[PDB]
């Protein structure tokens, strides 16, 4: 609490960077008398905070390292092996007075190599590499929205026919461990990336993106065909001669406050298994880097509705239980939406009413109202056209964001 962590996932340079700062004034310490005790205390605090940063790294289209831990795909000791900062000094280079700082960097390949377990790779013009331009907003496969690509340790490349073109297991494992399956780049670097993709790369535009976490570029079949056409080009996949260009927001992911530990990921795993077992219709869950969002589709009730249907009583029961599984030290943002009724005034009020009713229903199930904030967005944030019943039902929803408090 006297110790604060700032951290950035630098996908462009392939490193996770952290700065841990000790506020001496807050910790009741003074320089130079307490330099050693203060420095040792910062070194004492650093391992757990660094561990939490590393859990936040996106591994693939669905999971972060913390999720993989929860699924027992990796061991906590493999992560803590990476948080030794004894090669770094405790300095006064902090921008704040009466502060000490400890900086630590870990290559992203150190995390990636924990997931490389395969033995051998599985398997026009000749090219020296593959350059995917995945900048901008990309249509999301299987959805109506368009979103930018997120970087991760193990992206996949799909064709528009959803043939799998590139995957971790296609890479020689030694090479996967040495320099990952891709490098992410910026158009502003004005680099050839000759090291990665040589002088004559195959330049390809991303036509879409796949994944819960929007990680997998989708490329035109004609472009996929070029890759698969020659041994020379197929060897590019085996060697990992692949660059993905993306936007700057994706290239530097700032790790938000506060940091969540392994227990957040364990609790989310429980929530997911719970919802999967309850099979509550039209309830989905997704995580951000330190939030969870439960989305309840086809919510029709409002603040002035009669006592809600039995079937809805059961669903809100399931939601309430799921929310509670994330523990007592959270708060909730409940946001209502409507389908496009061509009635903006009504949509505005209705979306607020929907969120209000959800909040009231949850507070009769043990979630104190002081923990809840409500908002309504009318039809202004659609996730589908409002043409069919099914698509209108998708828009008509309440999103519950679980936040640290
Ligand atoms: Cl001081
Ligand atoms: Cl030192
Ligand atoms: Cl996915
Ligand atoms: Cl509606
Ligand atoms: Cl209106």
* Residue ranges with CB less than 5 Å from ion ligand 4: 338-339, 396
3-state secondary structure of 320: helix
Tokens representing residue 220 in the block = 């035109």
For the chain, the first-to-last Cα distance in angstroms comes to 15
Query: How far is ligand 2, taken at its centre, from the CA of residue 42, in Å?
Result: 10
Query: How far is ligand 4, taken at its centre, from the CA of residue 146, in Å?
Result: 22
Query: How far is ligand 3, taken at its centre, from the CA of residue 54, in Å?
Result: 21
- The string over 337-368, giving b where at least 16 C-beta atoms fall within 10 Å of a residue's C-beta and e elsewhere, is bbbbbeeeeebbbbbbbbbbbbbebbeeeebe
Distance (Å, whole) CA 62 – CA 211: 7
Distance (Å, whole) CA 174 – CA 133: 26
Distance (Å, whole) CA 182 – CA 176: 9
In this structure, which ligand is nearest to the CA of 28? 1
Query: How far is ligand 5, taken at its centre, from the CA of residue 337, in Å?
Result: 16
Tokens representing residue 81 in the block = 């092996």
Query: How far is ligand 4, taken at its centre, from the CA of residue 341, in Å?
Result: 7
CB atoms within 10 A of CB 158: 22
Element at 9 (helix H, strand E): strand 3-10
The burial class, CB within 10 Å (0-12 / 13-18 / 19+), for 200 is: exposed
In this structure, which ligand is nearest to the CA of 30? 1
Q: At what angle do helices 310-324 and 344-363 cross, to 10 degrees?
A: 70
Give 283's strand partners.
296
The answer for residues whose C-beta is within 8 angstroms of residue 235's C-beta and 6 or more apart is none
CB of 265 within 8 A of CB of 55? yes
The burial class, CB within 10 Å (0-12 / 13-18 / 19+), for 88 is: middle
Q: Are strands 242-245 and 130-133 parallel, antiparallel or unpaired?
A: parallel
The domain locations on the chain are: 1-117+247-260, 118-246, 261-405
In this structure, which ligand is nearest to the CA of 142? 3
3-state secondary structure of 206: strand
Query: How far is ligand 5, taken at its centre, from the CA of residue 43, in Å?
Result: 60
Query: How far is ligand 2, taken at its centre, from the CA of residue 11, in Å?
Result: 28
| φ and ψ at residue 273, rounded to 5 degrees | -65, -40
Distance (Å, whole) CA 2 – CA 384: 46
| φ and ψ at residue 13, rounded to 5 degrees | -100, 0
Query: How far is ligand 5, taken at its centre, from the CA of residue 309, in Å?
Result: 29
Q: Which of 164, 131, 137 is nearest to 150 (CA)?
A: 137
Query: How far is ligand 5, taken at its centre, from the CA of residue 343, in Å?
Result: 4
The burial class, CB within 10 Å (0-12 / 13-18 / 19+), for 281 is: exposed
Q: How was it solved?
A: X-ray
Distance (Å, whole) CA 46 – CA 72: 24
For the CA atoms of the chain, what is the radius of gyration? 24
CB atoms within 10 A of CB 267: 18
Query: How far is ligand 1, taken at its centre, from the CA of residue 98, in Å?
Result: 4
Distance (Å, whole) CA 42 – CA 354: 47
Does residue 94 have a cis peptide bond before it, meaning omega lies within 30 degrees of 0?
Answer: no
Query: How far is ligand 4, taken at its centre, from the CA of residue 346, in Å?
Result: 9
Q: Give the DSSP per-residue string, 220-254.
A: -HHHHHHHHT-HHHHHHHHHT-EEEE--HHHHEEE
Distance (Å, whole) CA 17 – CA 54: 10
CB atoms within 10 A of CB 398: 25
Query: How far is ligand 4, taken at its centre, from the CA of residue 372, in Å?
Result: 22
């Amino acid at each position: 609490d006297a110790v604060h962590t700032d951290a950035v996932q630098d996908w462009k340079n392939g490193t996770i960077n952290a700065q841990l700062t000790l506020d001496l004034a807050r910790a009741r310490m003074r320089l130079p008398a307490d330099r050693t005790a203060a420095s040792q205390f910062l070194r004492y605090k650093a391992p757990a905070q660094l561990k939490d940063v590393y859990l936040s790294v996106l591994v693939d289209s669905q999971n972060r390292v913390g999720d993989c831990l929860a699924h027992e795909k990796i061991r906590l000791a493999d992560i803590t092996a990476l948080v030794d900062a004894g090669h770094h000094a405790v300095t006064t280079l902090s921008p704040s007075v009466r502060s000490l700082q400890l900086s630590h960097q870990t290559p992203l390949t150190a995390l990636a190599r924990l997931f490389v377990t395969h033995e051998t790779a599985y398997v026009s013009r000749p090219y020296t590499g593959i350059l995917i331009d995945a900048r901008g907003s990309l249509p999301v496969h299987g959805e109506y929205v368009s979103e930018p690509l997120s970087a991760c340790l193990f992206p996949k490349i799909w064709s528009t026919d959803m043939d799998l073109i590139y995957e971790k297991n296609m890479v020689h494992p030694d090479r996967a461990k040495a320099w990952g399956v891709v490098r992410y780049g910026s158009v502003w670097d004005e680099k050839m990336y000759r090291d990665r993709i040589g002088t004559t790369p195959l330049k390809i535009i991303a036509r879409g993106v796949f994944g819960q976490q929007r990680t997998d570029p989708i490329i035109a079949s004609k472009d996929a065909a070029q890759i698969l056409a020659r041994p020379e080009n197929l060897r590019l996949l085996a060697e990992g001669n692949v660059i993905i260009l993306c936007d700057e927001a994706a290239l530097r992911v700032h790790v938000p406050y506060p940091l969540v530990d392994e227990h957040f990921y364990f609790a989310y795993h429980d929530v997911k298994r719970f919802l999967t077992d309850e099979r509550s219709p039209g309830v989905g869950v997704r995580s951000g880097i330190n939030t969870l969002k439960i989305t309840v589709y086809d919510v029709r009730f409002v603040a002035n509705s009669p006592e809600i249907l039995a079937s809805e009583k059961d669903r809100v029961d399931v939601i309430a239980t799921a929310l509670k599984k994330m523990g007592p030290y959270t708060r909730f943002l409940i946001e209502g939406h409507t389908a496009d009724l061509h009635r903006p005034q009504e949509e505005a009020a209705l979306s607020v009413a929907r969120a209000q009713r959800m909040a009231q229903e949850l507070s009769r199930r043990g979630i104190e109202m002081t923990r809840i904030t409500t908002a309504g967005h009318g039809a202004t944030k659609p996730i589908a056209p409002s043409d069919t019943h099914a698509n209108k039902a998708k828009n008509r929803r309440v999103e519950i964001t679980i936040l640290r408090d």
